Scaffold this active site. Structure first.
Site, PDB file in Angstrom:
ATOM      1  N   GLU A 125       0.847  -1.194   0.000  1.00  0.00           N
ATOM      2  CA  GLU A 125       0.000   0.000   0.000  1.00  0.00           C
ATOM      3  C   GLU A 125       0.884   1.246   0.000  1.00  0.00           C
ATOM      4  O   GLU A 125       1.827   1.323   0.791  1.00  0.00           O
ATOM      5  CB  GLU A 125      -0.919   0.030   1.217  1.00  0.00           C
ATOM      6  CG  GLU A 125      -2.008   1.075   1.067  1.00  0.00           C
ATOM      7  CD  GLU A 125      -2.902   1.154   2.268  1.00  0.00           C
ATOM      8  OE1 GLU A 125      -2.566   0.518   3.286  1.00  0.00           O
ATOM      9  OE2 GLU A 125      -3.939   1.843   2.196  1.00  0.00           O
ATOM     10  N   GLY A 266       2.753   2.063  10.951  1.00  0.00           N
ATOM     11  CA  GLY A 266       2.475   1.205  12.092  1.00  0.00           C
ATOM     12  C   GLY A 266       2.299  -0.261  11.726  1.00  0.00           C
ATOM     13  O   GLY A 266       2.831  -1.150  12.394  1.00  0.00           O
ATOM     14  N   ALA A 267       1.522  -0.535  10.681  1.00  0.00           N
ATOM     15  CA  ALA A 267       1.164  -1.909  10.339  1.00  0.00           C
ATOM     16  C   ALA A 267       0.372  -1.894   9.039  1.00  0.00           C
ATOM     17  O   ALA A 267       0.157  -0.826   8.457  1.00  0.00           O
ATOM     18  CB  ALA A 267       0.360  -2.578  11.455  1.00  0.00           C
ATOM     19  N   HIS A 302      -7.081  -2.266  14.966  1.00  0.00           N
ATOM     20  CA  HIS A 302      -7.225  -1.572  13.694  1.00  0.00           C
ATOM     21  C   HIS A 302      -7.037  -2.516  12.520  1.00  0.00           C
ATOM     22  O   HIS A 302      -7.866  -2.563  11.603  1.00  0.00           O
ATOM     23  CB  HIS A 302      -6.198  -0.446  13.669  1.00  0.00           C
ATOM     24  CG  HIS A 302      -6.287   0.449  12.481  1.00  0.00           C
ATOM     25  ND1 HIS A 302      -6.768   1.737  12.569  1.00  0.00           N
ATOM     26  CD2 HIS A 302      -5.916   0.271  11.191  1.00  0.00           C
ATOM     27  CE1 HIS A 302      -6.704   2.308  11.381  1.00  0.00           C
ATOM     28  NE2 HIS A 302      -6.189   1.441  10.528  1.00  0.00           N
ATOM     29  N   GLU A 303      -5.954  -3.287  12.534  1.00  0.00           N
ATOM     30  CA  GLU A 303      -5.694  -4.145  11.389  1.00  0.00           C
ATOM     31  C   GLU A 303      -6.767  -5.217  11.274  1.00  0.00           C
ATOM     32  O   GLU A 303      -7.188  -5.559  10.165  1.00  0.00           O
ATOM     33  CB  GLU A 303      -4.311  -4.782  11.483  1.00  0.00           C
ATOM     34  CG  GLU A 303      -3.151  -3.785  11.547  1.00  0.00           C
ATOM     35  CD  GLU A 303      -3.184  -2.756  10.439  1.00  0.00           C
ATOM     36  OE1 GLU A 303      -3.564  -3.113   9.310  1.00  0.00           O
ATOM     37  OE2 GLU A 303      -2.845  -1.582  10.705  1.00  0.00           O
ATOM     38  N   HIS A 306      -9.957  -3.838   9.732  1.00  0.00           N
ATOM     39  CA  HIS A 306      -9.826  -3.682   8.290  1.00  0.00           C
ATOM     40  C   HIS A 306     -10.322  -4.908   7.531  1.00  0.00           C
ATOM     41  O   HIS A 306     -10.639  -4.802   6.342  1.00  0.00           O
ATOM     42  CB  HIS A 306      -8.361  -3.450   7.880  1.00  0.00           C
ATOM     43  CG  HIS A 306      -7.948  -2.010   7.791  1.00  0.00           C
ATOM     44  ND1 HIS A 306      -8.666  -1.062   7.095  1.00  0.00           N
ATOM     45  CD2 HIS A 306      -6.846  -1.377   8.258  1.00  0.00           C
ATOM     46  CE1 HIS A 306      -8.043   0.103   7.169  1.00  0.00           C
ATOM     47  NE2 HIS A 306      -6.934  -0.062   7.864  1.00  0.00           N
ATOM     48  N   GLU A 325     -10.035   4.182   6.301  1.00  0.00           N
ATOM     49  CA  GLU A 325      -9.219   4.579   7.448  1.00  0.00           C
ATOM     50  C   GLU A 325     -10.032   5.322   8.509  1.00  0.00           C
ATOM     51  O   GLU A 325      -9.931   4.997   9.695  1.00  0.00           O
ATOM     52  CB  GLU A 325      -8.014   5.400   6.991  1.00  0.00           C
ATOM     53  CG  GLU A 325      -7.131   4.614   6.025  1.00  0.00           C
ATOM     54  CD  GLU A 325      -6.616   3.338   6.637  1.00  0.00           C
ATOM     55  OE1 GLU A 325      -6.777   3.184   7.866  1.00  0.00           O
ATOM     56  OE2 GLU A 325      -6.046   2.506   5.897  1.00  0.00           O
TER      57      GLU A 325
END
Ligand SMILES: [NH3+][C@H]1CCc2c(Br)ccc(Br)c2CC1(O)O
Ligand SMILES: [Cl-]
Ligand SMILES: [Zn+2]
Length: 891
Positions: A125, A266-267, A302-303, A306, A325
């Site tokens: 990304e 971050g990830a 968060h991940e 997603h 996001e």
């Protein structure tokens, strides 16, 4: 004069990519990538050339339908685009194949396929997949992926890519391979591969409704395997939250999380294979500061979230970034608030928004959460897109309430599952719930869409009236957004204002809390049967991302601070009291400076405010986390939103005076609390248990370390004794605080060496030590930075190392902004050096320049001169050039 992409220009591709079959063959000095794309002609095709993105690839061969294409005659490649002339492009289904060579071992930009210590890993990304192989590298090109990875087995025993592992096999010469099938259509930015000597922790999760067994794995290098457990616990919590609140279950048989040491962000939410900066996945209570635990909970959550908001529903185009996001941050915020059950969680998000994001939204970089154009999409992973986006996504929940919010969210998932989507698709789903809640099929959220298209922070201001004979209270409200370079005319937004009314005589609520819907430039809200004059509690929970002008007296703000029910309004009332004092003293110092006065007056801090701080601090039933906010002045980047041509010298003098005014009255209270809090703050329950975190106890340590800092700055009698004992604590939050606060004493360098030795054998702890040094309030900080460069950082290209050494120092108000400009020169030199191998990190390092046009005349010019010097550097990256041209109003 760069290549600029515009939101309005979106159009579907003339081609379709249905399947991607990769063979990634890793060798010491090259990686060979073979790729077959099963393609078709779309209904939008008009006979155009077939153009693939491909950046920095070395072509061995390319083919259509197993016939090699001929360079020059049939295709051209310019190291950015591969053009196949339409004369040679089939008119129906066809296969394109290629073999290219890439070099992860020299890829220091950490985009595409690269080497992080002894791990091979990808980051695709936004537009990095084109650095691995040819593709139409845009998120609306969705395909199914069949990926084989091969490598030396001794060096790379663990091979991973997205989805089901369908085969493992041995290869002559000490090699082996693994093959993966990901059945879910995806854009290429969600592709990932990992190869390394990885160790893991694992668990089995059983989904709530379908009772699917999911294997969960968390991976790191062997040295740090003992730091994996909290992340796994966080993942299980995240999965349960998405099941419980949103009814969403995971959709693969396995989910892998992987920590790598070198990572730009971050990830990353790659499908079934989430990859993390190690600092956002790994922790242990012996070798991590407390804040690691909330960071990992946030990023792992968060991940995971997603997987639906980003992966199962993805993006039509990169202008829709906030759709995944902003929404995923909002989902993580709901999750973390429920997990921590501390009021400070929400407060930390507000504190961040109103400092860094408000700064951005009044800067030359200001943009709406759905931008209108870009050059490098990587420059638009911004606090606006993420954090203002999250507040816009949260406003839907405030407006609809939980029941109808969940209904609208389910409509969004149901209508768009498995597809690309746009911000309008989300607003439409919310609109269907809105019509239900309002019981009115003519209700609509058309105005709400302005939150996606209008840049700038609204200002909301209040006036009041109370008629005691009528028992009638009125709140007159006004909104205003300042014209900027995106819209010279601003429109009123749909602003939800959560309000309560407090009886100042007994502190009790006078109305059911209610959310006022301001949709016009101004409105008057009237309340009947208000028995006495109230104090209004405005924007409870920080219910809209706005500048709040409460027009309350400090007496009224003190009463809210003491008695209101809403943590945000109490904190904001305190913030507003401080800002009134800050602006007054700042102006007093500024005049004395400008007029070269030989004598002048300063306005003392409000004594009733100091009494109220003492009252709250001494209340054994009040919250330690909240207390740490009240004894701290507002952030410098918050303050600067209210001062023109800010002189950082005068601001530093202003803060110094106010802190000492308060400490001269409260230091004995501070010391008493620092001592009385020790037993509970530092209690060692669960110190050997990485599955449980006490967030309230952590907030007690935060309070203790805040108080210690105040007492150390004040040179409280014999406080060095406390600092030295604090350096012996098992908690890194404590012993690293002892380094920070010792800056004011002759023992600083003794504790520098002590804590270095405690930190140097854990990569992440050493980075935390670097941050602690960098932020130390030392007169000799410039010499200390040189010491860090020469003795510790040296030639590291690790983004965590570079960011740790320089970014905390840039927040040193007095020293970074030295009027000589030496701090601006120092950071610009680092930016230019870093840009030659990692453009993303170089642009991250530009952060202190974002406020350049808000400073005093001299510092403006100093900062502008350094930015223009950076812009003159030969071979400057597109990332850095775009950023600096926009920031200096050239783009
Ligand atoms: N999609 C990824 C982009 C990288 C990134 C950035 Br840049 C800033 C904050 C976060 Br959190 C992340 C993680 C992520 O999942 O959003
Ligand atoms: Cl195979
Ligand atoms: Zn994200």
């Amino acid at each position: 004069e760069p290549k600029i992409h515009y939101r309005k220009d979106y159009k579907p591709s003339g081609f379709i990519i249905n399947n991607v079959t990769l063979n990634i063959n890793i060798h010491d000095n090259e990686t060979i990538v073979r790729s077959v794309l099963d393609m078709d002609i779309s209904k939008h095709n008009v006979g155009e050339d077939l153009v693939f993105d491909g950046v920095g690839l070395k072509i061995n061969e390319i083919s259509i339908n197993n016939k090699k294409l001929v360079e020059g005659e049939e295709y051209t490649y310019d190291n950015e685009f591969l053009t196949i002339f339409s004369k040679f492009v089939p008119k129906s289904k066809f296969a394109f194949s290629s073999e290219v060579i890439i070099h992860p071992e020299t890829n220091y930009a950490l985009t595409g396929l690269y080497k992080s210590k002894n791990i091979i890993v990808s980051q695709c990304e936004a537009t990095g997949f084109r650095r691995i192989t040819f593709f139409i590298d845009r998120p609306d090109m969705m395909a199914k992926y069949d990926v084989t990875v091969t490598a030396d087995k001794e060096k790379y025993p663990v091979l991973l890519s997205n989805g089901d592992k369908v085969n493992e096999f041995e290869i002559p010469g000490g090699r082996h391979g693994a093959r993966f099938n990901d059945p879910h259509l995806k854009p290429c930015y969600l592709f990932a591969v990992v190869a390394g000597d990885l160790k893991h922790l694992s668990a089995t999760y059983i989904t709530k409704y379908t009772k699917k067994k999911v294997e969960l794995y968390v991976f790191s290098e062997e040295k740090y395997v003992s730091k994996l457990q909290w992340a796994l616990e966080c993942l299980k919590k995240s999965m349960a939250f998405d099941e419980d609140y949103f009814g969403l279950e995971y959709d693969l048989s396995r989910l892998n999380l992987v920590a790598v040491s070198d990572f730009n962000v971050g990830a990353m939410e790659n499908k079934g294979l989430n990859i993390f900066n190690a600092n956002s996945l790994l922790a242990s209570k012996k070798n991590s500061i407390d804040f690691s635990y909330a960071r990992i909970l946030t990023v792992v959550g968060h991940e995971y979230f997603h997987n639906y908001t980003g992966n199962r529903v993805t993006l039509r185009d990169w202008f829709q970034l906030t759709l995944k996001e902003g929404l995923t941050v909002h989902r993580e915020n709901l999750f973390s608030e429920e997990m921590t059950k501390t009021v400070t969680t929400r407060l930390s998000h507000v504190d961040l928004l109103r400092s860094v994001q408000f700064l951005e939204d009044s800067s030359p970089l200001s943009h709406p959460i759905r931008p209108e154009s870009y050059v490098s999409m990587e420059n638009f992973y911004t606090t606006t897109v993420y954090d203002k986006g999250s507040e816009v996504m949260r406003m839907y929940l405030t407006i609809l309430g939980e029941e109808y919010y969940k209904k609208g969210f389910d409509i969004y998932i149901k209508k768009n599952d498995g597809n690309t989507a746009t911000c309008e698709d989300f607003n439409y789903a919310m609109e269907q719930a809105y019509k239900m809640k309002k019981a009115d099929n003519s209700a609509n959220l058309n105005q709400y869409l302005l939150w996606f298209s209008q840049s700038g922070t609204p200002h909301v201001s209040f006036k009041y009236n109370y008629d005691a004979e009528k028992k009638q209270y009125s709140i007159h409200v006004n909104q205003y957004t300042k014209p900027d370079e995106n819209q010279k005319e601003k429109k009123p937004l749909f602003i939800p204002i959560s309000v309560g009314l407090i009886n100042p005589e007994n502190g009790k609520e006078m109305i059911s809390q209610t959310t006022l819907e301001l949709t016009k430039e101004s409105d008057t809200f009237v309340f009947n049967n208000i028995a006495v004059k109230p104090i209004p509690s405005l924007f409870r929970g920080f219910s809209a991302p706005v500048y709040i002008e409460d027009n309350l007296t400090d007496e009224e703000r003190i009463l809210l601070l003491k008695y209101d029910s809403d943590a945000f309004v109490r904190y904001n009332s305190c913030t507003n009291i401080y800002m009134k004092q800050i602006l007054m003293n700042y102006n007093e110092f500024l005049k004395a400076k400008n007029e070269k006065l030989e004598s002048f007056n300063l306005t003392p801090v409000n004594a009733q405010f100091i009494d109220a701080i003492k009252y709250l601090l001494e209340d054994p039933h009040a919250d330690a986390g909240f207390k740490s906010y009240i004894v701290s002045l507002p952030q410098d980047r918050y303050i600067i939103n209210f001062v023109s041509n800010l002189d950082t010298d005068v601001l530093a003098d202003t803060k110094e005076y106010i802190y000492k005014q308060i400490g001269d009255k409260l230091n004995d209270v501070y010391y008493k609390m620092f001592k009385s809090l020790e037993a509970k703050a530092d209690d060692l329950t669960y110190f050997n248990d990485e599955s449980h975190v006490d967030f309230d106890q952590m907030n007690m340590r935060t309070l203790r370390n805040t108080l210690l800092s105040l007492l150390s700055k004040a040179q409280y009698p014999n406080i060095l004794n406390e600092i030295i004992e604090h350096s012996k604590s098992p908690y890194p939050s404590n012993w690293l605080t002892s380094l920070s606060v010792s800056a004011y004493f002759d023992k600083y360098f003794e504790l520098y060496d002590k804590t270095y030795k405690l930190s140097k054998d854990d990569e992440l702890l050493l980075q935390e030590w670097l941050k602690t040094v960098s932020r130390s309030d030392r007169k000799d900080i410039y010499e200390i930075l040189k010491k860090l460069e020469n003795e510790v950082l040296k030639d590291s290209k690790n983004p965590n190392d570079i960011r740790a050494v320089y970014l905390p120092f840039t927040n040193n108000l007095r020293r970074f902004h030295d009027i000589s400009g030496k701090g601006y020169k120092l950071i610009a030199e680092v930016i230019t050096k870093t840009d030659k191998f990692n453009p993303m990190v170089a642009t991250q390092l530009c952060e202190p320049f974002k406020l350049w046009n808000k400073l005093d005349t001299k510092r403006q010019e100093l900062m502008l001169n350094e930015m223009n010097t950076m812009l003159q550097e030969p071979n400057i990256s597109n990332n850095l050039k775009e950023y600096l041209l926009r920031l200096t109003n050239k783009l």
